Amino acid sequence: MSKVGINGFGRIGRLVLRRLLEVKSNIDVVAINDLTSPKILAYLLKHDSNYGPFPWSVDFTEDSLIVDGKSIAVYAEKEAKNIPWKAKGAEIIVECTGFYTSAEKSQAHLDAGAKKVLISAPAGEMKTIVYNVNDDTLDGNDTIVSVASCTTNCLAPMAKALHDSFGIEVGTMTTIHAYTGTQSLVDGPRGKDLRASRAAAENIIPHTTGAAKAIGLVIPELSGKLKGHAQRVPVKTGSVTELVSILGKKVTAEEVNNALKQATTNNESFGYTDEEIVSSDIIGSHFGSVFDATQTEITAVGDLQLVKTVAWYDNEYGFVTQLIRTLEKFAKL
Amino acid sequence: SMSKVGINGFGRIGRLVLRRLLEVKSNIDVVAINDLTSPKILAYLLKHDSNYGPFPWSVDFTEDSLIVDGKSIAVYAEKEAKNIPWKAKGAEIIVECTGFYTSAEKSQAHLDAGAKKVLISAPAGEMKTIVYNVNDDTLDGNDTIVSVASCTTNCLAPMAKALHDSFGIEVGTMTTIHAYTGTQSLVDGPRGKDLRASRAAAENIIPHTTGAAKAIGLVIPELSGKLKGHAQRVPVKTGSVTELVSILGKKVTAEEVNNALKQATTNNESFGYTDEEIVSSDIIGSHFGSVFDATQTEITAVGDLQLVKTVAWYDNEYGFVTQLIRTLEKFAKL
Amino acid sequence: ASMSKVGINGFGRIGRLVLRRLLEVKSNIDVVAINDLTSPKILAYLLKHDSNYGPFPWSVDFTEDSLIVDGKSIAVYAEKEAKNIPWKAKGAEIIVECTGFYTSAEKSQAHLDAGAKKVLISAPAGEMKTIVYNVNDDTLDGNDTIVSVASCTTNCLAPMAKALHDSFGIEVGTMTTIHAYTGTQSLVDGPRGKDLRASRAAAENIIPHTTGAAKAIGLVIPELSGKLKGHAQRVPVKTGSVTELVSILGKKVTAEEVNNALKQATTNNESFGYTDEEIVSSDIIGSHFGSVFDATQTEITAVGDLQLVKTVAWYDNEYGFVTQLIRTLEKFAKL
Amino acid sequence: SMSKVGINGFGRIGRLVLRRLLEVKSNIDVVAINDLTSPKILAYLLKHDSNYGPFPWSVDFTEDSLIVDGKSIAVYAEKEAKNIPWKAKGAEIIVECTGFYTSAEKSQAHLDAGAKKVLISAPAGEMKTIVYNVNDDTLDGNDTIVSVASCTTNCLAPMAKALHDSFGIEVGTMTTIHAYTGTQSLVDGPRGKDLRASRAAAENIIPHTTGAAKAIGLVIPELSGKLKGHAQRVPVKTGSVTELVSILGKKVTAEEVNNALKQATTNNESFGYTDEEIVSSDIIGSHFGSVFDATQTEITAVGDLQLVKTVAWYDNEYGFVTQLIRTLEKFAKL
Ligand SMILES: NC(=O)c1ccc[n+]([C@@H]2O[C@H](COP(=O)([O-])OP(=O)(O)OC[C@H]3O[C@@H](n4cnc5c(N)ncnc54)[C@H](O)[C@@H]3O)[C@@H](O)[C@H]2O)c1
Ligand SMILES: NC(=O)c1ccc[n+]([C@@H]2O[C@H](COP(=O)([O-])OP(=O)(O)OC[C@H]3O[C@@H](n4cnc5c(N)ncnc54)[C@H](O)[C@@H]3O)[C@@H](O)[C@H]2O)c1
Ligand SMILES: NC(=O)c1ccc[n+]([C@@H]2O[C@H](COP(=O)([O-])OP(=O)(O)OC[C@H]3O[C@@H](n4cnc5c(N)ncnc54)[C@H](O)[C@@H]3O)[C@@H](O)[C@H]2O)c1
Ligand SMILES: NC(=O)c1ccc[n+]([C@@H]2O[C@H](COP(=O)([O-])OP(=O)(O)OC[C@H]3O[C@@H](n4cnc5c(N)ncnc54)[C@H](O)[C@@H]3O)[C@@H](O)[C@H]2O)c1
Ligand SMILES: O=C[C@H](O)COP(=O)(O)O
Ligand SMILES: O=C[C@H](O)COP(=O)(O)O
Ligand SMILES: O=C[C@H](O)COP(=O)(O)O
Ligand SMILES: O=C[C@H](O)COP(=O)(O)O
Ligand SMILES: [Cl-]
Ligand SMILES: [Cl-]
Ligand SMILES: [Cl-]
Ligand SMILES: [Cl-]
Ligand SMILES: [Cl-]
């Protein structure tokens, strides 16, 4: 299988294409489904507010995109069951619309003639993969798999290293997170979520995330031991996750940091920095998560000890690089 | 005399319509609201405003209503206007603020649904179109559907009218540097067919079409076909400014243009004047439709060839709403 | 009827709102003098036009050496060094110190040398009486001459910590505040003292930032010295900020139980408010509280007998902090 | 030799100057940098850029130097240019990017400090002022202090040149909608005597004077006195756009203007062309001084009279910098 369809050519969907081409994958994107014309998807692909001009040629026809000389079909089917995946033989669907985050929903891509589905979001009780953490759990028999959220790919490698070195007995996270398409431009209805209805570029907005609640799926031993949430803020991309943990051993900052450095060495998914970076330095990062040793903090009072560890993430591109790693491997089995 | 109002589209404009009605202690009585959501969500949005802060009156809700300052207001959720039960509470004048009924053909559905008149908060083609204190004397008892044009029109028109009256505008072109609005996009993604509107509004200067100058003839007939213009949408949440570059009908100095504008703003509740070094946030919550800024006036001349740039600020949300309400209160007494 | 005469040093974001708040509440204090680094014209323009709070609610004019505010004169000086400020010329006896450059006993001493009697500093100023109104203002007496009101963050954190302490005990905790950007940061990438992160464009980044609010909490709640640490993340909102605290408390608790203890702590408490509405930061702008506890963000995380407790409070680091500074100033001035 | 360069002001422009020189593999050799801080801090700023991302070469520092791509650059901290020890490493041409030496009299100080020539990164009064590919042919061997004018001059000049050559410009006025810069304020507070410059830059539309139009005569002598203009500073970090409204010497169509402009941009490394529906973030990183935008051309005509609006984008940081470097590469070989 090296024949891929993208459902939802949005922020994540367009970067999936950018990244496959950046690394010369032997995967060919042959079809795209969205809700618009080829002309509009081409304008969007060619001109990116966050990452600049497309590095390759982009043109269109009435029913297709021409990207670096290759034709890619464009469909506009609102319901995934009606998508002609069979037409160009789309074998693996990268599902990035947000409207098919379950086994039962992404089932419709199978019923429309696809073999597998990789969902770019948490998708309930299914095999959920952070690359370089639990991707060894994938087999030939898997059809519909999830890569969880940007936050889950940030949190998990940091949690994994802490759990391996020290044990995490209990923990809570806060991610300070760039605003996304789920939020609003101006104050107005955004389904049931009251907070999501508020102008995203003019507010700090508390926001639910299951990254920590559903970490059980990626790190089985931490199942039900983490909770967390987000504060969405007015940066366009680039985020950071703080974890506060009661660990299984007394530790020093240097000790926590050395252990993290160890876990990041020749680790293409998980980086390290000892530099005084800010969110914009993470934009275009090729990691899922970059641990920041400068923000490590140990608060100790006797027996009791709280350990704050902080990792950066490019929630768009960084998360994507993880999505592509997982995709390449899903596609070889 | 016609005191009972329905609001269709309880959005940025619709919410502030109510805020401004209560602020001026109008005898107009908002009896019903229609939108696409629950009373709970509307009540949340009404209490809490990112641009203007906490609502100055109490806000609660029921399964089917808002309770604002102790007074009950019915809430309906009908997406097609012809199905709004305006008769239940005797809603007579509908303030149409959804963006989806911007023509006589479309807004007449409120009449079908049992209302008496419609005031549309946006341009709506070739119909009676009013900028208060510019052409509100053209209203009469036979007007049943009326437009107040756009924020931009309520800014430009009084500046243009003043220049028309004192000097003549032979030809001109407008550019408005305008706050982003809910028609734009939060992140890069499709936004109908307008390519530019697909781009992240808070992270970009975005060129944007607007008919304010194009359709000025509806408000000042003698300027019909003599102006063009466009917008540059920028990352401020509200507050905007309009520059007009004109060939006037007479040779002028900057001091002469400013005195003529000052005279037009004197005792004019719709049209302010300033020569303070203000910036956009100083216009947020303005009670004018337009505020002429004398500090930005510029005369460029070479022999007989003269270009005149005049500039006016406007709070495209609340300030425009003050005009909307002035127009509503007159409409209702006809 | 006590009419203390006040001078303001540093007519900045905080200094200006101090005057705004004093007139807003009709305080008996008269502000008789202001010192900054500029002309009365520039100070008048800034007082009149405010990007966060809108137009000044009172008339503002200037002469070559004064502001005229609602028809009252306020002398204007421009003395880089506080010892040269002529506070005696208009009888200014209580200086509200808001420049950032006199944050110690030894430095603010200069206001007394120059003829003032008391100084209240609008920031942490080391080992000195450090007041969060409605937490420890009863430590104030007639013998105090130089006092601090700590930071905005201390004024957010201390009431929430106080109530948790009083109700449950806190064994240990750690704080993160997601904080509006301020004048100590940069507009564009460029040198800002010695703090590398402060050099980066404030409106375009999440910027980690050290704050002493947790570390020095003991000056305000002595039982908690050494028990808390924390830091900030600076983000692109112009004002309005939120403080999270992750605590191990000395009792097992539920969320409801935590939220009820906080509610009771906020009852008839002019300094410390409560919400259970789904507010966001722009809803805190213009708050008349130093801190507003948010019941909606309370989180208990539990395994066996291990419980982590997250509590969260909003604050307008500008106006809200200023209401606290003014309460503290009214009491300080009457002693 | 004249291949050895010092940078005064290692700021937004100073650092991108070094970035650009390395990017085009110039045989210019930056031997010295002066600013007001430590090499630690300069190294941190060069390595990590909020607008352009990570520096593409290595950066380390010592107590008195930077090491950029393995090459040592001396760092001084002399707030008065007369005291900068340029002779120590033999800096002959100074790229003056502080903003504090924007006159012949002031930049003379670099020559008394032992340098041979100064290139000022801003307007600087009546001295030879260069927009590359408009009037770089005017530089000669004897010039010791020159200007590259502003970002806005580099954007306006080539558009005005093309219009001037093809149709004549009788008179015209300009408005640039311009990214905020370091002369503005993060929070409301004193900023010298420009009142508007004291207002929070990322929360306002802020009008602002610029000499781009007024001083155009230095770059295109025939347009001396024929243009005026100003800016509206808005909340984007870099990337700007310039609109010019002109009375031309001929009657024209939109297509005719667009084709003339397209001709002037053909094989022009300094002056780009687009007919794509771009927005400001699309110009960030541009290797042009100016990119004419055909999509925004507008002809407003009534009988005999005509106004023509033409629009060009520019990356006021990197794009302007690319013109500065073209000019410096010629300057160094005269
Ligand atoms: N942006 C992030 O930071 C981020 C990070 C990790 C994961 N994700 C996840 O990836 C998914 C996509 O997020 P995004 O940021 O790219 O969203 P987006 O809104 O930018 O993109 C959604 C795209 O899907 C299209 N679409 C919507 N409904 C559709 C349908 N029924 N059929 C076909 N196309 C449809 C839209 O037109 C749009 O192009 C979401 O599930 C999100 O939770 C997002
Ligand atoms: N925001 C401005 O600056 C501004 C200024 C002047 C005029 N206007 C005009 O006012 C109108 C409203 O603008 P807005 O900014 O308040 O938009 P908005 O998106 O904030 O509000 C639209 C509201 O109408 C609701 N709505 C959408 N479709 C509906 C339907 N079929 N039936 C009932 N409700 C529906 C939405 O749920 C929302 O509450 C538009 O025509 C706009 O052009 C806007
Ligand atoms: N969020 C907040 O802004 C906030 C909250 C709580 C406490 N504080 C504290 O209050 C103090 C002021 O903060 P700000 O935000 O008002 O700063 P600011 O920069 O807005 O104001 C400082 C003012 O002091 C002037 N100044 C500088 N040095 C001076 C000197 N030697 N003499 C006289 N005037 C001088 C400046 O011209 C400016 O007007 C700081 O100590 C700060 O930590 C700030
Ligand atoms: N940023 C733009 O958009 C832009 C575009 C075109 C031209 N310019 C011009 O280029 C020049 C620099 O602009 P910038 O945006 O890089 O400014 P900036 O504030 O980022 O850079 C100024 C640099 O000079 C240093 N400095 C200040 N005074 C000094 C002194 N006496 N001696 C040595 N160093 C000193 C500062 O520390 C800083 O590193 C200005 O003249 C400006 O007009 C700027
Ligand atoms: O731009 C982003 C999407 O619509 C939502 O992504 P999210 O699920 O990460 O909030
Ligand atoms: O949908 C939200 C706004 O109404 C759009 O306002 P606008 O029509 O002025 O762009
Ligand atoms: O100049 C001082 C700043 O305006 C205030 O910032 P701070 O509250 O971070 O100290
Ligand atoms: O600090 C200097 C500013 O960055 C320069 O830009 P400007 O002079 O074009 O405002
Ligand atoms: Cl037009
Ligand atoms: Cl517009
Ligand atoms: Cl600490
Ligand atoms: Cl001019
Ligand atoms: Cl400018």
Short mmCIF file of C-alpha atoms and ligand atoms in Angstrom, two decimals, chain B residues 151-152 176 178-179 181 208-210 230-233 314, ligand 10:
data_model
loop_
_atom_site.label_atom_id
_atom_site.label_comp_id
_atom_site.label_asym_id
_atom_site.label_seq_id
_atom_site.Cartn_x
_atom_site.Cartn_y
_atom_site.Cartn_z
CA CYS B 151 -20.37 50.66 8.85
CA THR B 152 -18.15 51.98 6.09
CA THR B 176 -10.78 51.90 4.65
CA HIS B 178 -10.99 48.06 8.77
CA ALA B 179 -11.17 45.80 11.87
CA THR B 181 -15.18 40.69 11.24
CA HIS B 208 -11.29 43.18 0.81
CA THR B 209 -14.02 44.55 -1.42
CA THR B 210 -16.68 46.83 -0.15
CA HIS B 230 -11.96 49.05 -1.12
CA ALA B 231 -10.82 47.90 2.35
CA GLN B 232 -7.66 46.53 3.90
CA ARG B 233 -8.80 44.29 6.76
CA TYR B 314 -15.58 54.83 13.09
CL CL E 10 -14.78 46.30 4.87
#
